[PDB]
Design an enzyme around this catalytic site. Sequence first.
Site: not given
Ligand SMILES: N=C(N)c1ccc([C@H]2[C@H]3C(=O)N(Cc4ccc5c(c4)OCO5)C(=O)[C@H]3[C@@H]3C[C@@H](O)CN32)cc1
Lengths: 250, 6, 27
Positions: A43, A99, A198
């Site tokens: 991602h 991922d 991340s």
């Molecule tokens: N441990 C946490 N609190 C945490 C870890 C990673 C992210 C990531 C990652 C995240 O949680 N999502 C949202 C998301 C969650 C589940 C999903 C998804 C997107 O698509 C399918 O399933 C993302 O996009 C990525 C985005 C990239 C950066 O900006 C930060 N963010 C956020 C919080």
Amino acid sequence: IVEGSDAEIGMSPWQVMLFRKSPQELLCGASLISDRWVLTAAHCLLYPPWDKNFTENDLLVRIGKHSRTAYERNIEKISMLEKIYIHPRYNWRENLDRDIALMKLKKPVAFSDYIHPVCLPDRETAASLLQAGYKGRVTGWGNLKETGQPSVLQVVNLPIVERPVCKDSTRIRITDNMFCAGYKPDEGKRGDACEGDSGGPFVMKSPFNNRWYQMGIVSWGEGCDRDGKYGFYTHVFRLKKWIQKVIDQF
Amino acid sequence: DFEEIP
Amino acid sequence: ADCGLRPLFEKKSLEDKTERELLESYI
Ligand SMILES: N=C(N)c1ccc([C@H]2[C@H]3C(=O)N(Cc4ccc5c(c4)OCO5)C(=O)[C@H]3[C@@H]3C[C@@H](O)CN32)cc1
Ligand SMILES: [Ca+2]
Ligand code: NA
């Protein structure tokens, strides 16, 4: 990293900063697994819903860092990317299953007191350490709060959580390629990865051979450090056949 | 707030 | 062969400030 602390010098020598060239900004975390291969989350490089699709020339990897913003003269090493390899079955539509991505560097990086590779787990490592209650460590230069940036690399130790608890905390479908970690509301302690962390590593120190192993990759969460929510991580051992295939072929 | 790189 | 052994910690038998918290959790 929310509710963590400043890392010590050389504490996480495999830590890699994925840095966007223009505009200049922290893109994500990553880890050094050999002199020419870096591991991160898919991602960080590909996420169509947000029109994210980086190519090799859009970024740089900065290794050996401690300060987030400073150019650490005579300490950090900057490397260019030769090629990006994203897992072919990375599921960005549904739940970020698989991922994981690898990045091959243009030239090998020399190891130093501040730059050194982390180990990848084998089946026995995974079975021994991937247990509820066992703690791993997450590091990164991401936000200090959900809604605030650090001067230097942050670190936090967090316990792996039972799979049913992880599943019951979210509406997202959890797969065998993910595990979750964090404290429960009744445990008092806190901490979580956040925006900017991340793609970074979740590591554990084997009590058998005293070596650090990267068991997970910071993958996703809902908010950061929220009570009753947990951070989700890519299960590195479960995807090791793919990692080996890529490195063996290229 | 990133310092310029070489 | 030397993966996971930190030059400033394991290589010189020095421990970081919180690694003992991890070991104590491996019960
Ligand atoms: N441990 C946490 N609190 C945490 C870890 C990673 C992210 C990531 C990652 C995240 O949680 N999502 C949202 C998301 C969650 C589940 C999903 C998804 C997107 O698509 C399918 O399933 C993302 O996009 C990525 C985005 C990239 C950066 O900006 C930060 N963010 C956020 C919080
Ligand atoms: Ca559920
Ligand atoms: Na939480």
